[PDB]
């Protein structure tokens, strides 16, 4: 089979404002095959209420998914996206950086 490793972006739906409700996004793209594990993390802990878009793919046949959850950012809380896939020996964790 052709396997392709996922690209990952972590970001909010709206520009972040401390204490305003928002959505935290983890966009996974460019990957094949389609089985992938994606968790959203708050201070290292798995967030339970996470939804995802319906599986779709690009012209080159690689897959993409958006994982998302409502959240209210604060100065202190640290958020991240944890991704595993068959192409990875270990999970990739990408931190939410509000400037990216």
């Amino acid at each position: 089979m052709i396997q392709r490793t996922p690209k990952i972006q972590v970001y909010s739906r709206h520009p972040a404002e401390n204490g305003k409700s928002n959505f935290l996004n983890c966009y996974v793209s460019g990957f094949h095959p389609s089985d992938i594990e994606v968790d959203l993390l708050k201070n290292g802990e798995r967030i339970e209420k996470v939804e995802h878009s319906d599986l779709s793919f690009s012209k080159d046949w690689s897959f993409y998914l958006l994982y998302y959850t409502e959240f209210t950012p604060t100065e202190k809380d640290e958020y991240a996206c944890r991704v595993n896939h068959v192409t990875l020996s270990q999970p990739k964790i990408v931190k939410w950086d509000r400037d990216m």
């Binding site: 520009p15 966009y27 095959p33 089985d35 319906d54 599986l55 793919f57």
Partner: protein
């Protein structure tokens, strides 16, 4: 051009039940429908408000069609394993994409019907809508069958007819969103990056459709080589986001301008720090 596309994914999972079939449909960059064979009572389901208004016969018939293609793809996966003498233990993926692009005359501009097995091209309908491209020996078996069955002539009629007719209908019913671009909300940020350099990042948020160009110029010259550009990404509310960044020497910020082109802007924007 406006386009309607369906993206179908079937995945075998030996020892974990029968294969899962998932399908989504889009007009341009907007999803309007999904189907998932693993759902409790699998149905074609609306995902945009402009098809939620289609009536009960529409959704019954779409459901029917999805269920029949899901069934056929369980068989397709079996067949493919046999064509390639694959082990029954492995998981495999069959993907299909079909649909139509709308021309300025309101007729078909281009139609598509193509497929990949395990991430690589399997069989595709050629642009002339008359003939097929098969990627390998296995696919040539499907090709010969489809040539003898006049499958291409049938697909041609669907692509020129129904596919365009429905696209046009969807575009009219969704015109307030599908035919009206949302311009990007733009700004620049500045992030000191060493004791003498700084990152300038030009943001475009909240835009539709997804197509956009962001460029940094220094002294009116494109900084193509030195610009970090992220892939355009969905905000999660039907709009998209993108940024472009460059690292500049501290104090030279005024020589840099960010240029934004988007269908929702009558003239390209320029931003500066």
């Amino acid at each position: 051009s406006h386009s309607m596309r369906y993206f179908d994914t079937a995945v075998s999972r030996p020892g974990r039940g029968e294969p899962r079939f998932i399908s989504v449909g889009y007009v341009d960059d907007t999803q309007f429908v999904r189907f998932d064979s693993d759902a409790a009572s699998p149905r074609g389901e609306p995902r945009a408000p402009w098809v939620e208004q289609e009536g009960p016969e529409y959704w019954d018939r779409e459901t029917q069609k999805y269920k029949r293609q899901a069934q056929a793809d369980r068989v397709n996966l079996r067949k493919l394993r046999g064509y390639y003498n694959q082990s029954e233990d492995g998981s495999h993926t069959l993907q299909w994409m079909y649909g139509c692009d709308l021309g300025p005359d309101g007729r078909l501009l281009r139609g598509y019907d193509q497929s990949a097995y395990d991430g690589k091209d399997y069989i595709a309908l050629n642009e002339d809508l008359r003939s097929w491209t098969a990627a390998d020996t296995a696919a040539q078996i499907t090709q010969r069958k489809w040539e003898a069955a006049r499958e291409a002539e049938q697909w041609r009629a669907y692509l020129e007819g129904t596919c365009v007719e429905w696209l046009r209908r969807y575009l009219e019913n969704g015109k307030e969103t599908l035919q009206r671009a949302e311009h990007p909300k733009t700004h620049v940020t500045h992030h000191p990056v060493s004791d003498h350099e700084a990152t300038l990042r030009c943001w475009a948020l909240g835009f539709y459709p997804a197509e956009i160009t962001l460029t940094w110029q220094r002294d009116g010259e494109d900084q193509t080589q030195d610009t970090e550009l992220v892939e355009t990404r969905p905000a999660g509310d039907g709009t998209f986001q993108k940024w472009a960044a460059v690292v500049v020497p501290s104090g030279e910020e005024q020589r840099y301008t960010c240029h934004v082109q988007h269908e929702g802007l009558p003239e390209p924007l320029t931003l500066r720090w």
